[PDB]
């Protein structure tokens, strides 16, 4: 897909 | 739900189609998560790709955005205050939130 799953880092 | 940039009828590809042919990094909307049913995804455009951050609804109606394992649990009492936080630069996302794609 063209979506990257990410987590918040701050 | 109720907010203008929350799309509920919306596939990943459809949202990627609406985020990427937007133009600027910083295009964002909220959609329902497909992997974690009942969760939400804050999606934003950055470098010709969409970056999705899952949002979990918790016990007492809190919204808990997925943080990494070295970042404090970060929760919001409602959804506009979560979006209000990420409109400001350097808050933990890949790019802050600039352009709301409305439904």
Concise structural overview:
The complex is a heterodimer of chains A (10) and B (103). With 10 residues, chain A is mostly beta strands. In chain A, 0% of the residues lie in helices and 30% in strands.
Classified by CATH, the class of chain B is Alpha Beta
Strand content of chain B: 25-35%
Q: Tell me, briefly, the overall form of chain B.
A: globular
The number of E-state strands of chain B comes to: 7
The count of DSSP E runs of length 2 or more, i.e. the number of strands of chain A, is 1
Helix content of chain A: under 10%
- State the end-to-end distance of chain B: 12 Å
Written description of the protein model:
Chain B: Keywords: Adaptive immunity, Immunity, Innate immunity, Phosphoprotein, SH2 domain. Chain B: One of its GO terms (molecular function) is phosphotyrosine residue binding. The complex is a heterodimer of chains A (10) and B (103). Chain A is an all-beta fold. Chain A contains no helices and 1 strand. Chain A has one strand at residues 3-5. Chain A is rod-shaped, with a radius of gyration of 9 Å. With 103 residues, chain B is of the alpha/beta class. Chain B has a single domain (1-103), classed as 2-Layer Sandwich (SHC Adaptor Protein). Chain B is 15% helix and 29% strand. Chain B is built from 2 helices and 7 strands, in the order E-H-E-E-E-E-E-H-E. Chain B has helices spanning 12-20, 80-85; strands at residues 6-7, 27-32, 40-45, 50-57, 63-65, 74-76, 99-100. In chain B, strands 1, 2, 3, 4, 5, 6 and 7 form a 7-stranded mixed sheet that branches. In chain B, a hairpin with a 5-residue loop joins strand 4 (50-57) and strand 5. The longest helix of chain B is centred in the N-terminal third of the chain and has 9 residues, at 12-20. The A-B interface holds A 1-10 and B 12-13, 15-16, 20, 35, 43, 49-54, 65-71, 74, 90-94.
């Amino acid at each position: 897909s063209l979506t990257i799953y990410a987590q918040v880092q701050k | 739900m109720d907010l203008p940039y929350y799309h509920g009828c919306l596939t990943k590809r459809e949202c990627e189609a609406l985020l990427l042919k937007g133009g600027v990094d910083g295009n964002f909307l909220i959609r329902d998560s497909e992997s974690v049913p009942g969760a939400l995804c804050l999606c934003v455009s950055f470098k010709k790709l969409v970056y999705s951050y899952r949002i979990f609804r918790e016990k007492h109606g809190y919204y808990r955005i997925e943080t990494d394992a070295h970042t404090p649990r970060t929760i919001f009492p409602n959804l506009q205050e979560l979006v209000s936080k990420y409109g400001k630069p350097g808050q933990g996302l890949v790019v802050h939130l600039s352009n709301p794609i409305m439904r």
